[PDB]
UniProtKB/Swiss-Prot annotation, chain A:
Induction trigger: Expressed in aerobic conditions.
GO biological process, one term: positive regulation of translational initiation
Organism name: Saccharomyces cerevisiae (strain ATCC 204508 / S288c) (Baker's yeast)
Keywords annotated in UniProt: Acetylation, Cytoplasm, Elongation factor, Hypusine, Isopeptide bond, Phosphoprotein, Protein biosynthesis, RNA-binding, Ubl conjugation
Crosslink position(s): Glycyl lysine isopeptide (Lys-Gly) (interchain with G-Cter in ubiquitin): K71
Protein name as annotated: Eukaryotic translation initiation factor 5A-1
The gene coding this protein: HYP2
Curated annotation (Swiss-Prot), chain B:
Job description of the protein: Component of the ribosome, a large ribonucleoprotein complex responsible for the synthesis of proteins in the cell. The small ribosomal subunit (SSU) binds messenger RNAs (mRNAs) and translates the encoded message by selecting cognate aminoacyl-transfer RNA (tRNA) molecules. The large subunit (LSU) contains the ribosomal catalytic site termed the peptidyl transferase center (PTC), which catalyzes the formation of peptide bonds, thereby polymerizing the amino acids delivered by tRNAs into a polypeptide chain.
Organism this protein belongs to: Saccharomyces cerevisiae (strain ATCC 204508 / S288c) (Baker's yeast)
One GO CC annotation: cytosol
Biological process (GO), any one: ribosomal large subunit assembly
Note: Present with 39000 molecules/cell in log phase SD medium.
Designated name of the protein: Large ribosomal subunit protein uL5A
Subunit comment: Component of the large ribosomal subunit (LSU). Mature yeast ribosomes consist of a small (40S) and a large (60S) subunit. The 40S small subunit contains 1 molecule of ribosomal RNA (18S rRNA) and 33 different proteins (encoded by 57 genes). The large 60S subunit contains 3 rRNA molecules (25S, 5.8S and 5S rRNA) and 46 different proteins (encoded by 81 genes). Component of a hexameric 5S RNP precursor complex, composed of 5S RNA, RRS1, RPF2, RPL5, RPL11A/RPL11B and SYO1; this complex acts as a precursor for ribosome assembly.
Keyword vocabulary terms for this entry: Acetylation, Cytoplasm, Methylation, Nucleus, Ribonucleoprotein, Ribosomal protein, RNA-binding, rRNA-binding
NCBIfam families: PRK04219.1
UniProtKB/Swiss-Prot annotation, chain E:
Name of this chain's protein: Large ribosomal subunit protein eL21A
Gene: RPL21A
Role according to the record: Component of the ribosome, a large ribonucleoprotein complex responsible for the synthesis of proteins in the cell. The small ribosomal subunit (SSU) binds messenger RNAs (mRNAs) and translates the encoded message by selecting cognate aminoacyl-transfer RNA (tRNA) molecules. The large subunit (LSU) contains the ribosomal catalytic site termed the peptidyl transferase center (PTC), which catalyzes the formation of peptide bonds, thereby polymerizing the amino acids delivered by tRNAs into a polypeptide chain.
GO CC annotations on file: cytosol; cytosolic large ribosomal subunit
Protein family per UniProt: Belongs to the eukaryotic ribosomal protein eL21 family.
Originating species: Saccharomyces cerevisiae (strain ATCC 204508 / S288c) (Baker's yeast)
Assembly mode: Component of the large ribosomal subunit (LSU). Mature yeast ribosomes consist of a small (40S) and a large (60S) subunit. The 40S small subunit contains 1 molecule of ribosomal RNA (18S rRNA) and 33 different proteins (encoded by 57 genes). The large 60S subunit contains 3 rRNA molecules (25S, 5.8S and 5S rRNA) and 46 different proteins (encoded by 81 genes).
Keywords: Cytoplasm, Isopeptide bond, Ribonucleoprotein, Ribosomal protein, Ubl conjugation
Subcellular location(s) per record: Cytoplasm
GO biological process, one term: cytoplasmic translation
Top-level taxon in the UniProt lineage: Eukaryota
Residues spanning the membrane: none
Amino acid sequence: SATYPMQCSALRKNGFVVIKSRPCKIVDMSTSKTGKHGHAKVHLVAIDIFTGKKLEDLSPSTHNMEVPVVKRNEYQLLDIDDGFLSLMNMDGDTKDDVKAPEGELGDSLQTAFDEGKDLMVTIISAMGEEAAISFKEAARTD
Amino acid sequence: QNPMRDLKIEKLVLNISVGESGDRLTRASKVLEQLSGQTPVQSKARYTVRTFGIRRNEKIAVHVTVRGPKAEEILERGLKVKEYQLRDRNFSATGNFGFGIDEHIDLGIKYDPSIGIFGMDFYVVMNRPGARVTRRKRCKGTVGNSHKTTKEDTVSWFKQKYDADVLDK
Amino acid sequence: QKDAKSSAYSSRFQTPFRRRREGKTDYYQRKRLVTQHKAKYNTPKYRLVVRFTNKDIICQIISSTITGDVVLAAAYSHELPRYGITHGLTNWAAAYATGLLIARRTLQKLGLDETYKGVEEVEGEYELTEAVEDGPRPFKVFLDIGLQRTTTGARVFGALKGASDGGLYVPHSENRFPGWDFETEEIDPELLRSYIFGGHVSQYMEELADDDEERFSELFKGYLADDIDADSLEDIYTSAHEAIRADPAFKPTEKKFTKEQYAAESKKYRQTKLSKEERAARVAAKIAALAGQQ
Amino acid sequence: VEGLRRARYKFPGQQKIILSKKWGFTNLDRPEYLKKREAGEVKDDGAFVKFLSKKGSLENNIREFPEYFAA
Amino acid sequence: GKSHGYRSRTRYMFQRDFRKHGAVHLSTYLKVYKVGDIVDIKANGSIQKGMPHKFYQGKTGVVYNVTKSSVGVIINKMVGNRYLEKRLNLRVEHIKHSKCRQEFLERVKANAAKRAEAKAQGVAVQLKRQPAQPRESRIVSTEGNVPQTLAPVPYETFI
RNA sequence: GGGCGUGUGGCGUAGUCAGCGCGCUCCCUUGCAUGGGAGAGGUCUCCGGUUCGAUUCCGGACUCGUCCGCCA
RNA sequence: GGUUGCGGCCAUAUCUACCAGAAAGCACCGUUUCCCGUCCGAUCAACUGUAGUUAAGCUGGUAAGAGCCUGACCGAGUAGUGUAGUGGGUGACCAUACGCGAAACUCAGGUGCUGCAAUCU
RNA sequence: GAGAACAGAAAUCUCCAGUAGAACAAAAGGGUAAAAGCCCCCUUGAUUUUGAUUUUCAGUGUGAAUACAAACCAUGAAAGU
RNA sequence: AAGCUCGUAUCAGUUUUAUGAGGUAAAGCGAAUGAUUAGAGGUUCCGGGGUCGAAAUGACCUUGACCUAUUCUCAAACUUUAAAUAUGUAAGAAGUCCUUGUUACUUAAUUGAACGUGGACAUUUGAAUGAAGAGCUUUUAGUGGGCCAUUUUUGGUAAGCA
C-alpha cells in the first residue's frame, strides 16, 4: 500500500504523518493529560514537506494516525530546461517528469548548472507527488 | 628401502596478486598465459578490506598451475633467475618449497611498453609416487608416515638435483 | 607434539559406518536404491551392481535382507576367455559382454529365457525390453554404479547396454551413451554400434600401428602374440555374443585344493595375538631391562 | 585450632573444627602417604604432588618417577 | 505471552543421542509392517517429515494402513473422561515392532506345543503362568560355613 | 522514583552494514565584486556484541535537557 | 584361513608410533587416438595389463598406549526417593519403620563379529 | 600450524591437522559432512481435483502441518525425490 | 429422572510378568559448553616493565598471554551417566495352526496383500485379586467467586501474602 497506519504514541519526532491528506514531517510533539482520570492527548505540530506549511492536530494517544511512505532517491542532472529537470538513474534510466524547484534552492541549482558543476539531486516520493529537496556536488568520480 | 621413493615435482603454481581489477589484471593474466602456455585462472576476493581498497569478488589475483616437464623448465628458469640460492626459510615442514621473484625480464620474456612489469610467486609442490591415495574418490586414504615427504628430504633433493646450495638462514 | 589428539576428542568422536570409513559405499544412494514401497511387502528390489577394478569388471544381481545382501547371479570379466575374449578385459565392449552374460545367466536361472530373447540382432538403437502381452513381465533391475562418476561414454553404461540387450528390463535414457550429441538431443546409432563391436580400439590400433611402432609393441603386445589384427576383433565379439547366447551356465573353477588346504598355509602365515601372561612377562622383562639400571 | 575458632564467630549457623586423618591437602592417610613417599612413586609439583599409576606407557612412567623403578 | 507450538518443550525429547547422530541404518527401511502389527512410536529428529507429535512419543499402537513410505497407526488418547481414537500417518523411521507381542506369540506357540505333546498322555498340562511362590523348606549346613559374628562399627570422621 | 530525547572536527548538521558549508591556516587569482585550490583538523558520547563491515543494528553505561509522580 | 564385490550391527571396528605381509586379489602404476572434463589427463573420462612395485594404500601384529566395550559382593545398600508417625529439633534440617535403588571412583578382562557370491598355495 | 615478490595483523596461492568447534534469511532450541553446508547445471510440484488425519480443541472454526488417491509436470543414467 | 438391550461379560483410580518411552532428584567438571582458585614445566621471527648493555629478531630478572600435566569450587535456561514415583502396550475364541478360493491391487512368477471356504485345538482358554450386575440412550437442574492441610514448587525479607 501507499500508506500505513500507526499509533500517536508510537509516532516520534522527525517522522512522517498524514495530516489533512498531506504528507507532513513532525517538528513538535506534546502530550497532556485530558483530566486527572483520563488518558493524555497528543498535540502534533508538523511541516508539509512539499509546501512548507505548518499543520497541527490533536488526538487521543490511543488513536491511530495515517503514515505515508517516503522514498528519497539520488540522481544526476542532465539538463534544466523549461522548469523541468532531466535526471539520470543508476543503470542508465532517465526521467524528465520532475519539475524544477521554484525557490532559492531552484535559483542556486540554476546558477550551479549554469556555471557547470556536476550536481547530485535528491528527489522524494510521497503519496503520488514528486519534488526535489536538495543538491550536492560529487567530490570524486569527476 | 628405495624402489619408488623418488621425489618428483607434483606441480608448479605461479601466483600474481595485482590487488585490483582491470587493465593490470588483464596484463598480468596475459603474462601468465604466455609463460605457461595455458590460460590462467583469476581468483576472487573473500572479504572487503579498506586499507587494501579491495571489496568482495573482483578477481583480484591471477594464478596458473603447470605440471610435468614444462613446469620443471619454468622452475629451471626461476632458479637461474635466483642464481640457484634459496633461503632455508623458503622450505616448509611438509616438504614443499617456494620463492618470489621480481619481473619477467629476468625470465626473458622481453619488455613491451604496454604490458608493464609484474613480479611473480613460484611455488613447487613435491610428492612421491602413490599420492593418488589421497586424491581418488573411492577408498580415499591417508599416506603412511615413512613415505611422506619432509623438509630434510626435499633440501637433500634440492642439493643433489639442480646442483644448488641452500643458505643457512 | 603437533599431531596430537586429546582424550576428550577421542572420547567424543563418533565414527562413521565401516563401509563409509573404507570409502566403498554411498549410504545416501544406498537408501534410495534398496528401500521398497511398503505396500509391496516383502518384494525384493534388484540391483545390477557394476564395479570396475583394474583388470576386472564385476557384475552382480543383488537384493537386500537385514542379515546382509544376497546375490542371485554374478558375472565377472575374467571368465570371458571361456567365451573367446582374451584381451582388453576392461574395455567398453568387455563391459557390454559382461552385461550380456549376466543378463542371459539371470534369465536362464529364472526360467524367463525362452521368452524375452532381448536384442538378438544388435544395431546400437536405444530401446528397452518391453513387456509381452498375456505373459510374465520382464525382469526389472536397477543400476548400482556406486561412487563411479556418471559421464557420457563411461563403461558402466556399456554394462547397462549389454544387460538391456540381453533381455533385462533396466530403466535408462540414452543421453549417457557414446555418440550422444549434446546440441542435437539425439543418439547416433552407428558410433554406439562401433563401440559395441570395439571400433574405438581397432581404429586406434590402425592409427597408431601405421606411424608409431614402438608403442604398438609396448601396448597391444598380446594382440601380436595372439596374432589378433584390427578387423578380426569385430567378429570375435560377434562369436562371443553368440557363445553367451548359447550357454551362460557358469561352470566354476576346480579350485586345485580344498578350503582347509588353503587354510593350513594361510593360518601358518598369519600372525597371532599375544596372550595376557606372556604380555605380563614381556613388560616384566622390559622393566628389568631399561628400568633395571641397564 | 584457635585461628579457626576465632574465624567461626563471623559465620552464621554451627561449624565444627575437625583434625583430619589425611596428610596435608591430599586424600591419602598419614601412614599410607608415608609408605607411598618412602618409594619414589610420588613426585612434587608447585604445591601438590603427582602419583604413580600402574597404567600408561612405560617410557613416560620411566622418564617421570625414576627412583621407584630404581629398585 | 505463552507459547504452545507444535514442537514446544521437545528439546531433550528430539535430541538424537550421544555419538549416534548422522544418517539412519538400513534395518529400519528393510523392516516390514503389516496391518494389525503392534508398534512402538519413538521419533527420529534427523527425519523431519512424517514426525509424530510429542504426545505420542513412547506410545504403542496398532497398524491399520500401509502406504509407500509411511504407516497408519491407531492410538487411544485420554481426552477428559474417555479415550478417543487417533489415526497417525508416520514415516517408518519413527516406529519399530513391539517386542512384548512377539514374546507373547512365542509363548502361544510353545504353549500349543506343550498341549499337543501332553495330549497324547493326559498329564494335567497346567498351562497357566504362576507368579513367584513362597520358597519352601531347605536345610543349610555349616560344613566349611561356620557362622561369623558381626557387630556394629563405632563412629569415625572419615575426611 | 519512572519515561522520553540528547552528544559528529569550533559550529550547523547530514548519513548506506564519516560528507560538506561556515569557522582555522596557507597559497593562487582577479576591480564594481572576488573566487578557487590545498592542507591541519572527527576514538561518530563511551564500552561491548552482532554483522564481511557497523554513525547506521542491538545491549549496557555516562552526561545534559525535558515530561509525569495523581484520587483520597 | 587370506583376498575381492555387495553388505548387517556401526570404535571390541577409532586414533598415535613402529613392525611384518608366501600365494592370489586389490592397489600404486604405463598412455592421451577415441567418449568426456579440467587453468592443469592432478581428480574425472578413455586405452593397455603392457614398462615396474610392495615404498604407500589395504590386512595383520606389537604398546604396564589414548579411547571404546564388558563385569564386579569396587565404591555403596552410599546419594537420592514412594509410603508412616500427636518422631527429634526454636529453626535449619535430621533419625527410625515398610520398600525401591544410582552416578563418579577402584579393580579385572577384552580390542571386531558375521551374511551372500567369487577366488586363492 | 608451516611456507611464497611487492604483501605487513587482515589481499592471493600451497600443504598438513581439523566430529563441525562453521554455515543453513531472521529469535531460540533441535537436525544436518561423498549433506540439509559451498559451487555449478536444468527447471517451476510455490500446479489441478476434492477427501482423510495431527496440533490448539467443544475433538467447532482459523492458522500451520502429515500421508495418500486421480491427473499433468520437473530432474536424474536410475532407484527415486 | 426415565429407562432400554442383555445376564456375569468387548470390565477395574490394583498387583505380577514381558516390553517400551522419559532427562527430573542425584551425580560430573584431571568429559563437551560456560564460570572459577592456586602454584609447576615450557613457548618467544611470538608480549610488557625494569637492570646490565654502543646497539642488537641482545642478555638477566619480573609480569602478562598461549600450550602441557595437575589442583580448589559451581550451573533453572550445562552435560557423558542417570534413579525413585508416576506412564504406553500385551497376557488369546474377534486366538493359533493346516489346506486352498477371490481380485481390476502387487510381483519376474499363485509371488505377496486383504477378506474368505473346509479341518484340528475347550474348561488351567492361557497371570493375581475383585466384581457390588455389564453395556447403551434421551432429557434436564444447579454450578462456572472457592478455601485449608502434608509433600514438590515460583515471586517476595516476610506474611493468617500472591
